[PDB]
Structure 1
Amino acid sequence: GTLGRAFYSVGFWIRETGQALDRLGCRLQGKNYFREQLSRHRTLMNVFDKAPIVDKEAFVAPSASVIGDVHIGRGSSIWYGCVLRGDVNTVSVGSGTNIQDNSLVHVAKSNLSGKVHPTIIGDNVTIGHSAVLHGCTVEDETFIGMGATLLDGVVVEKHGMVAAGALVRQNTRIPSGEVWGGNPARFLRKLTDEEIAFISQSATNYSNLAQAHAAENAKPLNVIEFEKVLRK
């Protein structure tokens, strides 16, 4: 509670005092390598008492910025450029789903707009590229189109495939096995069975591909490039 934040602030104070002592010692020796412009990014950024919990079998890209109370399930992939932010409430990411390139998830930061709704993601949810889910719950086994603009309060239930470029209005549920697209999300047709199988097929292939990357993206730092950067 409040007491923990006081100890956190005192921790900052003592940490900065020690850091300044370190800088004085380094600078007294005639070294100024603390003035570099190294990118101070963490792929698992947190706040005082959120500390995002990620499953060990999941894969998170280095460019991903998981912030807040984001929970990641088993086998799900967190691709490059996604901006999953979960400070205000929980952001549950299902098991076996995937969050593609240049996507994100809000929690609707400002509390002025009514009550903040936590984001829930179901299992095997093939979230599309450039998805901007604005704090909406999404049930399992569904597909989200590229460039979708899901807003808060939306309940996309099972098999509710959402067309590309959709702008589904807030608090408007998508019927099961029904596609909604356009500006705004309007009924187009009913979901077919081959696409029903294709959703799970794509989820499985993306999970396997993410496993392959995690196998190859955890390679040691290859100090050859480290020497290349320094020697210039």
Structure 2
Amino acid sequence: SLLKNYPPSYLYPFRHPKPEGVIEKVLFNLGSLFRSAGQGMDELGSLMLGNGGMQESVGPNLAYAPVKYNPAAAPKAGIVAPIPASAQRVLGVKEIVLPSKAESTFIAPNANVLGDVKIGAKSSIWYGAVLRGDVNSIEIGDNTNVQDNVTIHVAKHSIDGKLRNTVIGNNVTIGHCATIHACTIADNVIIGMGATVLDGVKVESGSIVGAGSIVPPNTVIPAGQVWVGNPAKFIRNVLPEENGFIASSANNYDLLGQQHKFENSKVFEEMLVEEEIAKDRELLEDKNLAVHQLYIFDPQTQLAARPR
């Protein structure tokens, strides 16, 4: 950048460096006193507030969260990991199953992905989606989009041997608020928003399941057909162009997932710095300011780039 004399408070807004001047040191000590008094007043107020005291704490990260490992039933989709020794002498669990995801995969912080979940590259798990692999494995293929508030569930195979794992193929779109229990979905399928897919349902490639449609258990939706309804029934065959739509939706949501992953993955200090970037961008919109005569500022980071 052009200048190197920028104030340290300007360069490090998240945390100012250690006070060096006498006045700064006195301000630091006064801030310490204020912090302690404020916490005391907070606790006194919390006493009157009653049970709970309106206390707040950081929440656990459930996007990458474990499940109890079963020695009888080995993991199928996810990886198994040891736990810290102190937690071993407290909890007594030897190993815990953890989800397995590729680097390109985007999982929202809100989303809860649990245990036996394998997610492929370029796939996206969006906000509010709950993926529980506690009893049986969940497999999601590449470029597959589990949208907002989608619930994917599994069950145990049981005596019959009926497969109760959930296998989702590549280029599959699961619409918002859809509920998928232990079913199998082939490649290039759109599941409509609100659609319920129950046990034993095999949806063949190229098919579309309509919005708000409940497909009955043990029903095979054949390839290239559109099925809608509360007792989901066939209405029409997929048009040739609608297939290109299916692929286009998958790819568009891949790009969308890349963007959302980029935004969410920034650290706090960078987020606060970017907030200040936006703010002084707004303040610098006036081009008759004295400083604008002095310098031309870089657009992405409003730092002096060259003199005017």
TM-score (norm 1): 0.77
Q: 1:36 to 1:145 in 2, by over 3 A?
A: closer
For the 8 Å contact 2:179–2:197, the answer to whether it is kept is: yes
2:168 equivalent among 118, 121, 129: 121
Question: What residue identity is the alignment partner of 2:68?
Answer: F
Q: Which runs of 5+ in 1 are unaligned?
A: 1-30, 226-232
Q: How many residues align?
A: 195
Higher alpha-carbon deviation: 214-223 or 45-54: 214-223
1:102 partnered with 2:149:
yes
Q: 1:40 to 1:135 in 2, by over 3 A?
A: same
Q: Which runs of 5+ in 2 are unaligned?
A: 1-39, 44-54, 70-96, 274-308
For the 8 Å contact 1:157–1:176, the answer to whether it is kept is: yes
1:151 partnered with 2:198:
yes
Q: Distance in 2 between matches of 1:40 and 1:187?
A: 44
Within a 5 Å distance, the mapping from 1:1-232 to structure 2 comes to 37-49=57-69, 50-108=97-155, 115=162, 117-222=164-269, 224=272
Q: Output one character per residue of 1:73-127: Cα deviation in whole Å (capped at 9) or x when no partner.
A: 0100010000011111110001011011111100036969985600000000011
Q: Look up the SS of the partner of 2:196 in the other structure.
A: coil
Q: Percent identity?
A: 49
Q: Look up the SS of the partner of 1:84 in the other structure.
A: strand
For the 8 Å contact 2:67–2:134, the answer to whether it is kept is: yes
Question: What residue identity is the alignment partner of 2:164?
Answer: H
Q: Output one character per residue of 1:18-67: Cα deviation in whole Å (capped at 9) or x when no partner.
A: xxxxxxxxxxxxx9x9x853323422121133211111110000000001
Query: What's the Cα RMSD here?
Result: 2.6
Q: Output one character per residue of 1:149-186: Cα deviation in whole Å (capped at 9) or x when no partner.
A: 00011000101110011100011010100011111111
Q: Distance in 1 between matches of 2:155 and 2:164?
A: 8
For the 8 Å contact 1:108–1:152, the answer to whether it is kept is: no
For the 8 Å contact 1:75–1:95, the answer to whether it is kept is: yes
